DNA sequence: ATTTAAATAGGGAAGATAAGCAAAGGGTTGACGAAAGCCCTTTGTCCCT
């Protein structure tokens, strides 16, 4: 999933738990939250257009990284470092 | 204006079953998009001659 995480970085590409979005539209106010992060804590990504890359399947980046805890399995490291760092940034 | 007070209201048995509750048709349309790129303009800012 680097080849799309690397898309997403090409792009504007931010991953927030904490927004204004959901009450105003022009707003673009995104906060991150280390303390609340958890085994099943969904997080959300905003880029602009809501421009995205499918996996042959129909997937984008969301639909990869909310399914099977798999945000807490690259945030936790036991992925390596590889993903790690990229996930971090 | 006056006009009475006491005693008591029954026990029993039943309250019917059979049949069926239609069929087609339809259920509106129009407004309520941010981020980025591109040219054009109108006015801060320094200039000379």
């Not at 799309?4 to 939250?33: A, P, Q, V, W």
Request: with cysteine; proline share 1%.
């Amino acid at each position: 999933i680097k080849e799309m995480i690397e898309d997403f970085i090409s792009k504007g590409g931010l991953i927030f738990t904490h927004s204004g979005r959901y009450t105003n539209t022009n707003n673009s106010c995104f906060i991150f939250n280390k303390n609340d992060i958890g085994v099943d804590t969904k997080v959300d990504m905003y880029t602009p257009k809501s421009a995205g890359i499918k996996n042959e399947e129909g997937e984008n980046l969301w639909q990869v990284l909310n399914k099977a805890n798999m945000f807490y399995r690259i945030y936790s490291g036991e992925l390596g470092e590889e993903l790690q760092y990229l996930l971090k940034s």
